[PDB]
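Journal club prep, notes for RB
We'll compare a predicted complex against what the paper describes. Inputs for the BND case:
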Amino acid sequence: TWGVSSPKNVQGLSGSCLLIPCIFSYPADVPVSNGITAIWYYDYSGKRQVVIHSGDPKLVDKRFRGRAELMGNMDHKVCNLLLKDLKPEDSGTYNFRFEISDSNRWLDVKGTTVTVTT
Ligand SMILES: CO[C@]1(C(=O)O)C[C@H](O)[C@@H](NC(C)=O)[C@H]([C@H](O)[C@H](O)CNC(=O)c2ccccc2)O1
């Protein structure tokens, strides 16, 4: 019962900040010996730019640096994403991924679509 659940659609005004509520889950029998890495991707099937990367921010795309931050407690299985200072180009799909081990990792196939308005 691996899974990720975040809203299908979210809306925000340009210049404003927007939060994407998110929670996830995985089997109680999976050992977690090195924490959980959290990663949010923008337009995964297109440009696939990294929005947030808890294991190493250097992987974060330059256009999202300083404008996106993770408001999630990995221990409580919360992956809320906060996007600050919204821009028209931020419109698109965001998909969350968490990694516990080489084989125990997961990418949400659904994802959340953001729409930025004037
Ligand atoms: C693609 O390979 C992996 C992965 O995400 O690294 C291997 C990983 O072991 C596996 N995790 C588990 C617990 O089975 C993982 C997982 O099957 C996928 O991330 C699930 N998501 C999707 O199937 C998917 C497919 C298309 C688009 C987006 C997501 O695939």
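Talking point for the session: The chain has no helices and eleven strands.
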